[PDB]
Design a protein around this nucleic acid. Structure first.
Ligand SMILES: [Zn+2]
Length: 511
DNA sequence: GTAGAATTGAAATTCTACCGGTGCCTTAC
């Protein structure tokens, strides 16, 4: 009785303001829970109107809905769309004049405004919280709610402070929405936001039109160039883990004539805006970017997402690869993997404060590395990482399309390990390989490694082959590459039996 | 002192840099 009357009102809003006909599966349930006064956590990795989960009940309820958003540009996109549908929406941010802000605040006070978009830093100021007490507050919705967990612990602490708001207003329902959240992030959102036994609704993470590919990184730039050229004019994004790398890569692509521009947070806001706008207008083919190029990109025809450096966790990977193929047509995610890049990230993590937070981050990084090293379907790894049970392989990932192939690697291991032995475990990868292929430069003849027996024993095979062999022995735990001594290749206890070679060994051909 | 890109006349030689990254808010004691 009381719950269907609510849903009836919601349906009319769905029709009258948004112009849709029927609720899809799951929508009515979330919307009803919110109308019934319950807290909600909505995880909709799919698409494409999860904003409706709060906008519709904000238009049925009497009072103001506050929507917390991480980005001025998001605030503006959503307020503008609501204004186009005739809804009294507004926002507050620092690019407004004071008199503009005052008029928004008076609108909230009078009930003219129905939805107010606002950043947590403004919202969580003590005095602002006090002014809210006097408004008629119907709901609080936190968009891109993964930011609570991903930013609230360090980069933007007011994201973690929103629970204080929750306790100040126990009678107003709170809703958190996100597209990417593993179990850890979900629990972190519930905790930090103080959600009270929330309805949790999680839809599928499957993107069947995205093909997940990985390529072992040997000649980064040449492989990237060859890959970009094979896209033959297609629109795409190339992610790197540093501003510098983004500038270089951008430049070096422009050199070869490719429509590419750099995008990162050290560029001026009018440049970033132009790059994004161009990319959207299809006036730019490729954006080369840090994580700054991200939220609030509604470009439906991104055909490839390249990770030139492996991301810091699977959620970032999922979210970034997921910008491809939003129109439903074949798109490709392509990861260029160097294990050394993992070691770099591991190093960055275990420099900061020990404890539970770092163990979570280390776990999530480690999971990213396991996805990269998997010899099973990539999609099975992703989907199961997110708690979506599946066992059948996808047929549309690099492991499924080109299965791993193993060979007797015993002899190769001997050569590589023996070569590392002879140089007394004081030299890096590049050097040890030079030795292996019998290629003579000054340092070989100078140090006298051209007379050694192992010198040139692997000249019959490429430097790519030996990098893969050695990368594999590091992964197996036979060889270390401790940054401690400038990434010198050292042998471990497990080296011995292979070096004498009665312990058998399969290796994999490189990807 | 490694590593990858670029430079040299394909393997050797310099030549670079050796590694984070995300955004709100700025209303003076
Ligand atoms: Zn697969």
């Amino acid at each position: 009785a009381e719950v269907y009357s609510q849903e009836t009102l919601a349906k009319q809003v769905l029709q009258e303001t948004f112009g849709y006909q029927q609720f899809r599966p799951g929508q009515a349930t979330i919307i009803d829970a919110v109308l019934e006064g319950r807290d909600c956590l909505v995880v909709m990795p799919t698409g494409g109107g999860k904003s409706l989960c709060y906008q519709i009940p904000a238009l049925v309820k009497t009072g103001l809905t506050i929507v917390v958003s991480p980005l001025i540009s998001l605030m503006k996109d959503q307020v503008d769309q609501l204004l186009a549908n005739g809804v009294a929406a507004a926002c507050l941010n620092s690019t407004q004049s004071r008199e503009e802000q005052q008029a928004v605040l008076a609108g909230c006070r009078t009930g003219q405004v129905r939805l107010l978009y606002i950043a947590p830093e403004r919202l969580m100021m003590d005095n602002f919280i006090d002014t809210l007490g006097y408004w008629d507050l119907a709901m609080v919705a936190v968009d891109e709610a993964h930011c609570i967990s991903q930013w609230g612990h360090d980069f933007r602490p007011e994201y973690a402070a929103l629970g204080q708001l929750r306790a100040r207003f126990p009678a107003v329902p709170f809703m958190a929405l996100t597209a990417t959240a593993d179990d850890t992030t979900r629990r972190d959102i519930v905790r930090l936001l103080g959600l009270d036994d929330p309805l949790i609704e999680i839809s599928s993470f499957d993107r069947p039109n995205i093909r997940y590919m990985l390529m072992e990184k040997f000649k980064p730039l040449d492989q990237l160039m060859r890959y970009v050229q094979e896209q033959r004019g297609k629109s795409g994004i190339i992610y790197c883990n540093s501003r510098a790398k983004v500038e270089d890569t951008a430049a070096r692509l422009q050199s070869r004539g490719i429509s590419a521009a750099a995008y990162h947070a050290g560029l001026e806001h009018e440049v970033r805006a132009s790059v994004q706008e161009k990319f959207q207008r299809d006036d730019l083919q490729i954006v080369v970017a840090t994580v700054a190029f991200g939220m609030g990109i509604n470009k439906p025809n991104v055909r490839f997402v390249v990770h030139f450096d492996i991301p810091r966790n699977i959620e970032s990977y999922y979210q970034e690869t997921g910008r491809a193929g939003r129109d439903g047509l074949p798109a490709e995610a392509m990861l260029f993997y160097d294990p050394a890049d993992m070691a770099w990230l591991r190093r960055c993590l275990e420099e900061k404060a020990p404890g539970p937070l770092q163990d979570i981050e280390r776990h999530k990084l480690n999971a990213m590395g396991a996805f990269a090293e998997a010899q099973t379907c990539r999609r099975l790894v992703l989907l199961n990482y997110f708690g979506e049970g599946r066992q059948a392989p996808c047929g549309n990932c690099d492991i499924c399309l080109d299965p791993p192939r193993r060979y007797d690697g015993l002899v190769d291991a001997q050569k590589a390990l023996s070569a590392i032995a002879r140089v007394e475990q004081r030299f890096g990868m590049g050097y040890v390989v030079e030795v292996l292929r019998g290629a003579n430069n000054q340092r070989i003849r100078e140090l006298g490694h051209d007379k050694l027996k192992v010198y040139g024993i692997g000249r019959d095979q490429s430097q790519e082959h030996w990098v893969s062999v050695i990368r594999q022995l590091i992964h197996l735990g036979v060889v270390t590459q401790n940054i401690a001594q400038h990434s010198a290749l050292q042998l471990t206890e497990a080296a011995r039996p292979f070096l004498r070679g009665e312990a058998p060994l399969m290796l994999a051909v490189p990807r």
